[PDB]
């Protein structure tokens, strides 16, 4: 069939990569980031490689409850369907059990975790219309001694893993797979001078294309019996 | 030594059970629930079995950020120390991925998860003073198709498991164990007419004493090398 895919936070990085690969495979695209100008540029990049592409740009903050409803309202309007959802929202800033505070925790929780779930709620009832869907969640790693300053994000990642398992079960009947994809390392700040490459088995860091090759597959028709899964493109824990 | 233990939501049920067993072992007790009258009655029950008991009643809502700080301020004042913490706060109301809503999710998150963590923050710096502590977290079961209407509570339980692991690592250096205790079934509403006993391996439902025997042990001196653990008194998953 000729599917429609909504890829969020795709102005660059992992989302941008998933966008191109998904375009590479003749998916109809609806794309999003906060920055209207950065996102436009991607559409131009995609149309350039593929002139006939159906790319839609809906700038906005997917962390915002209302921006969400509006985006989904639009897609339902301009597309009439939705097959694939790519939940891709960054977690909060790094923190420590010592350094953490509770105002921000709630924020972060709301910013990513709730966002993803609401987004699935909307995607799903759209998806349910055609008894088909592919939900891929960009999530990251737990558990282990943040330590990596990822205290709040790790507990969020856990909650998200749990929730997806649940959701996957509730939505399977409807031919909608729900899987989490945890990349490891790509393009995102942080602070020679860099032997983190030493600690990863493959001894290298991820690439958005590698991550995107995976998400593309999960998005495909042949991936119809794969749900409730948790798969890392991390080269090793 | 002569330790001091703070057991929250101990007006009855599991917390009440932990309170008596801990009293049974000559811990100095600080106890809490929302209901001043229900909690008082426990003190009377404890003093009655043990006349010499040091029981302190601090009524209050441990879900409340400010009530929390105040309770800990008091304990630090009237006790000068704290050895054992019993994080015992009920989760939110049951919900479904379908039926759930996001206002309540945030609430629930704040009500239990954040509560426990803040409570540990306060307990710990108190505990750090004597290079000794025992943090037991009353948590429950994930993951599996709520289904049991436990959608939001399951993802919260997951986040809590993750966070404790982390915290356990950060606090071990200070001789403070952090373990989660997941009971299964005890005294708490729900809606013959009841073959849930069929689905549990032991074919029976938990008892607060069983749960309390465990928490008491984790609270003991001999349990000094047991941290970051996850242990069910559920008779079987």
UniProtKB/Swiss-Prot annotation, chains A, B:
Location of this chain's protein in the cell: Cytoplasm
Main location: cytoplasm
UniProt GO BP: antibiotic biosynthetic process
Gene3D superfamilies, alphabetized: NAD(P)-binding Rossmann-like Domain
Enzyme Commission number(s) from the entry: 1.3.1.-
Reported induction: The compound guanosine 5'-diphosphate 3'-diphosphate (ppGpp) is essential for the transcription of the bacABCDEF operon and BacG, and GTP regulates the transcription of both this operon and ywfH via the CodY-mediated regulation system.
Keywords noted in UniProt: Antibiotic biosynthesis, Cytoplasm, NADP, Oxidoreductase
Sites where the protein binds NADP(+): 11-14, 33-35, 61-62, 89, 112, 184-190
Annotated InterPro entries: NAD(P)-bd_dom_sf, SDR, SDR_fam
GO CC terms, sorted: cytoplasm
UniProt pathway: Antibiotic biosynthesis; bacilysin biosynthesis
Any one GO molecular-function label of the UniProt entry: NADP binding
Stated consequence of mutating residue 112 to A: 5- and 2-fold decrease of the catalytic efficiency and the affinity for ex-H2HPP, respectively
Disulfide bonds listed in the record: none
Protein family membership: Belongs to the short-chain dehydrogenases/reductases (SDR) family.
Subunit structure: Homodimer.
Role this protein plays: Along with the bacABCDEF operon, BacG is involved in the biosynthesis of the nonribosomally synthesized dipeptide antibiotic bacilysin, composed of L-alanine and L-anticapsin. Bacilysin is an irreversible inactivator of the glutaminase domain of glucosamine synthetase. BacG catalyzes the stereoselective reduction of exocyclic-delta(3),delta(5)-dihydro-hydroxyphenylpyruvate (ex-H2HPP), adding a pro-S hydride equivalent to C4 position to yield tetrahydro-hydroxyphenylpyruvate (H4HPP).
Protein name: NADPH-dependent reductase BacG
Gene: bacG
């Amino acid at each position: 069939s000729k599917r429609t895919a909504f890829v969020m936070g795709a102005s660059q990085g992992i989302g941008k990569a998933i966008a191109l690969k998904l375009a590479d495979q003749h998916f109809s695209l609806v794309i999003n980031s906060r920055n209207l100008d950065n996102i436009e540029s991607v559409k131009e990049d995609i149309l350039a490689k593929h002139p006939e592409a159906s790319v839609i740009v809906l700038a906005g903050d997917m962390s915002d409850q209302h921006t969400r409803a509006g985006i989904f309202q639009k897609i339902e309007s301009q597309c009439g369907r939705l097959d694939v959802l790519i939940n891709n929202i960054p977690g909060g800033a790094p923190d420590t059990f010592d350094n953490c505070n509770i105002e921000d925790m709630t924020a972060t929780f709301t910013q990513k975790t709730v966002a993803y779930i609401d987004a699935i709620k909307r995607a799903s009832s759209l998806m349910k219309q055609n008894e088909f869907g592919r939900i891929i969640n960009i999530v990251g790693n737990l558990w282990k001694e943040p330590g990596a300053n990822m205290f709040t994000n790790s507990m969020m990642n856990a909650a998200l893993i749990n929730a997806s398992k649940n959701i996957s079960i509730q939505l399977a009947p409807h031919n909608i797979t729900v899987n989490c994809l945890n990349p490891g390392f790509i393009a995102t700040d942080r602070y020679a001078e860099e032997q983190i490459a030493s600690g990863i088995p493959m001894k290298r860091v991820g690439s958005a294309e590698e991550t995107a090759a995976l998400a593309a597959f999960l998005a495909s028709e042949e991936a119809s019996y794969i749900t409730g899964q948790q798969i890392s493109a991390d080269g090793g824990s």
